[PDB]
């Protein structure tokens, strides 16, 4: 069981980094998107560069 | 007289004022704009909150 429960931990420890290295992109990703919700909508558009 | 002198008192306005038009086409142009995006954003608000 202590060998079941070394190897069910790496399992677990890949899982927690997986999550831990996604979550950073994704929150990135609507991140991102928020900055596009905030410019395009209508400042590109009065920001057109004139 | 008094007649032709309201004319040559206007005659100065008249060209300065005129001189404007060009700007006020781009003005009601880029105005129009802020119309119809006003209008938009009035749909997709009702559409929400239905």
Known sequence: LRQRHTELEREVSRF???????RQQYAQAKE??????RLIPQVTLLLDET | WQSARELLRDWPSQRHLADRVQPLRMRLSELEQRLNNQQNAERLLSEFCK
């Open chain 1, 16 to 22: 927690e980094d997986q999550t831990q290295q996604q």
């Open chain 1, 32 to 37: 991102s998107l928020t900055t596009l919700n």
